[PDB]
Structures are given as C-alpha cells and as structure tokens.
Amino acid sequence: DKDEAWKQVEQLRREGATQIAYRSDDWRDLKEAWKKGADILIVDATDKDEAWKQVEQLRREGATQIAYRSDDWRDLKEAWKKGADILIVSEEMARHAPKDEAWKQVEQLRREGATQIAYRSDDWRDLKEAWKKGADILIVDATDKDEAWKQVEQLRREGATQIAYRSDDWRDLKEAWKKGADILIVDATG
Ligand SMILES: [Cl-]
Secondary structure: OHHHHHHHHHHHHHHOOOOEEEEEOOHHHHHHHHHHOOOEEEEEOOOOOOOHHHHHHHHHHOOOOEEEEOOOHHHHHHHHHHOOOEEEEEHHHHHOOOOOHHHHHHHHHHOOOOOEEEEEEOOHHHHHHHHHOOOOEEEEOOOOHHHHHHHHHHHHHHOOOOEEEEEOOHHHHHHHHHOOOOEEEEEOOO
8 A cells, every 4th residue: 555655665665764665566555655765666566567668757856776576588678778776686586587588687787886785585595596696686585574584683783784674564664664774665565
C-alpha cells in the first residue's frame, strides 16, 4: 500500500536515516517517495517491458540516484543509458549464458563513471562471492530477521562499506541500520 510505504520513508527520515531507498514499478510513486525522504529510487523492472521509461521520467524530475532492478543484462544496459546509476542484480542473472557473461556485461558498465552494482541474495555464501567479484552494495534479503541481522553484522565486521536491507516495516529497517546497514530499502511491492 502506497500510503503506508510512504509513511515508512517518513518515519525513517524522522529517525535520521539519510540513505533511504524505495522500490516500485511506478515513477510517480517513486517521485513521491523521493519528496518524502528517499534518496535511492529503485525502478522495479522484474516483470515489466521497457521499464527504463520509468528511469527516463525520474531523470527528468531531477533524482540523481536511480536504481534499476533486473536480472537481464541487456535491460540493465538500456536502463543505465537512460540514467540509472545503480544496477541491482541477483543470482538469477547468471542463469542465461553461463560463465559470467551477464555479470561481466554489468561489470563493463561499472567502469562508467559513478555506476554501482548492487547484489541481492538471501544466501550468505552467494552474497560473499558477489562481494568478492566486485559488488559495491550488498543487499541482505534473508527473511529470517535473526539470520539477516547476523549477516548485516558480519558484513560490517568484514568491512563491507554499503550494506543494504529491505523491509516493508521501518522498525525492522531501523534495527538493520543500528546493526550496520547503511542503505534502508522500503519495499512494499509484496
Ligand atoms: Cl531491489
């Protein structure tokens, strides 16, 4: 629900968070979240066609940290061309053309100015290996909050510099933040 999701952004802003993220398929929803305190606007392209047009509008509106969630490297490339600077990928990307072709293609983009790769997983080893191969942002997606907070904590101890965590509940996001997460993704897509 849009109203409740926006409220999560607002409460996190009131708590002092400065790297709030917001995930939606709709640029108008993302623009409102931006107004309310979200700095990272995640365009959800997971089941949509030409979702890079959402990136185009957000670019026009003046947002500077637009992310694009896709496991299709050609689609991520087009999103980058349309103004996305954070490319959010997962294990599903290595599905097609095995031998890191997809990963390697997103790595070519990472060499383009401030372009960053974010890798999401619910699996610790997956996340660690993605970090080793050059992921800039590590999104802890385990739904066992106990396991997720242990992973946020260990990433901090191991020196990961941009740990992210996703929830539909600002209270969980605040707990992740306290434990070392810097990027707090409000995600009411479910
Ligand atoms: Cl995401």
